[PDB]
Amino acid sequence: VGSVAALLTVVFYIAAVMATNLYGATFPEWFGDLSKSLYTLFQVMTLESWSMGIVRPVMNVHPNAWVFFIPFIMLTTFTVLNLFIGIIVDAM
Amino acid sequence: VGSVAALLTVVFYIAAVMATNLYGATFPEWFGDLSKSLYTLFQVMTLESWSMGIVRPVMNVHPNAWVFFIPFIMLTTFTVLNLFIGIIVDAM
Amino acid sequence: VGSVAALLTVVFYIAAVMATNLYGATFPEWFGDLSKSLYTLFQVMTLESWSMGIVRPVMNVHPNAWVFFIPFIMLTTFTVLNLFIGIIVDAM
Amino acid sequence: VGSVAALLTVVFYIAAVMATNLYGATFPEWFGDLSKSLYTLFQVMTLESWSMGIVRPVMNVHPNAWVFFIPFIMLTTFTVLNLFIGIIVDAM
């Protein structure tokens, strides 16, 4: 469980650094600093307004933004589910 | 199953009291009384418009609001999933 | 699996009849006929805009609407998850 | 796991071709080409704004659009969950 939880933290910090660099200047409310980026990527992970609210407005400036966000979703959504199931099975 | 269901009820009432106190005055439609608070925190748990609809408007007045909401989500989303899986396994 | 799938169909039709009757006149686009109601309740089940998009506008006319929708969500979200897990385990 | 992952890829490409053909002319931002279609159908799968954001605007032009989208959701949401659970069990 600890290895999976540490993997997600490292992935979350690398992604939030990457997103600050890529979309910070063009989208400062969502990715203007590391803290705004970490909060936004958490929102993207929970799936909340990920496309209509964040990704589509971003893609109008950065067409390839889907190469960042879609894999981020596919990985974090799998890892979180694997972490929760892992913690539940270990507690049993 | 009963212990997990009781844990969530106690956590839900403490959070909705806390939210009434913190955000009630500045956001009365969402946290103006305990009943509005319990409804909103349920909506936050289901992930529905949690960030674009509630948390981002709140953070514009209370910058640290994420310290309340993010852990609330992480805990309730884990507990509910643990309660549903627990009820399914016990029925088998 | 068949018993769970039949339980959800009966619950979905009873709810969609109830919602047509209760909210049809005041909210015709969402519950004006049985077909619009069945579609809306499916959207409510997937959690999509359930509160900001449907339930909050409804509650402004019908304050108690949460007594219908919250249990509907709690039941269908549990049943669907139980049906999917049940179908997966039976296939193994 | 490989058979389930290949089934989803074939289903995703057939659906995105079908959606390009059906809704491309009337809704070009969402289904104007295969690339836009594949992105939108992924967003529909994650449940993000599927009804208020995409399906309801589409249904105002194509009333039967629900015959495409509802089964697409029911199938992909089941398959993805079956793929993730399958990958987790195989890793154990």
Ligand SMILES: [Br-]
């Ligand atoms: Br989470």
Ligand SMILES: [Br-]
């Ligand atoms: Br479903």
Ligand code: NA
């Ligand atoms: Na959602």
Ligand code: NA
């Ligand atoms: Na969801």
Ligand code: NA
């Ligand atoms: Na939403």
